[PDB]
Amino acid sequence: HMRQPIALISVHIYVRQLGEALAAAGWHVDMFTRKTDPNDPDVIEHSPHCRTIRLQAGPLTYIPREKLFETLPKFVEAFKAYHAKYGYPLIHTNYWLSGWVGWQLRQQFNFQWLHTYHSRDETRLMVEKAILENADCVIVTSPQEEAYLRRWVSKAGQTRLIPCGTNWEAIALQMGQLYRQLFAASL
């Protein structure tokens, strides 16, 4: 629908399943995550318009989320080689760490930026505030996490409820609709 090459970013199963259901509905989807082994493949094609791209960004090993922040400037540089060619009009970031990447990108480029929230503290809170303030839309997966965000992080920004679940077709349809809403708001 609406506008073509979209990028989902998950530095660290939410994104993999979303992008495949999105592409089933017709979106051209490139999903980016980090490499965690030097024998990892660079591109995994799932369908003619859906693939996962694994970027070398920090050590070629499994790094847990609580140690990933320092790898993000490298993830931004690796991603910028793909964004330099594909020019993604929409980028959808997953978890606050990928959102830092989205935040850095949005400071340099003009794209529709959506972010999905999920539930060191000093860094996370400042970054989560920056994302809420500058992203076009932040997705929460339950009222309880929306309640937490508004209580403990910030009241700023636009949040939308797309609930946790195992029906990825349904989720993708709701996400797709948001994408198109964002794109039409160009006026």
Numbering used by the authors: 25 to 36, 53 to 159, 174 to 241
What text comes from the article?
SPS catalyzes sucrose-6-phosphate (S6P) synthesis by using UDP-glucose and fructose-6-phosphate. All SPSs identified so far belong to the GT-B type glucosyltransferase family and contain two Rossmann-type folds. The N-terminal fold is called the A-domain and the C-terminal fold is called the B-domain. Thermosynechococcus elongatus SPS is a kind of sucrose-phosphate synthase (EC 2.4.1.14).
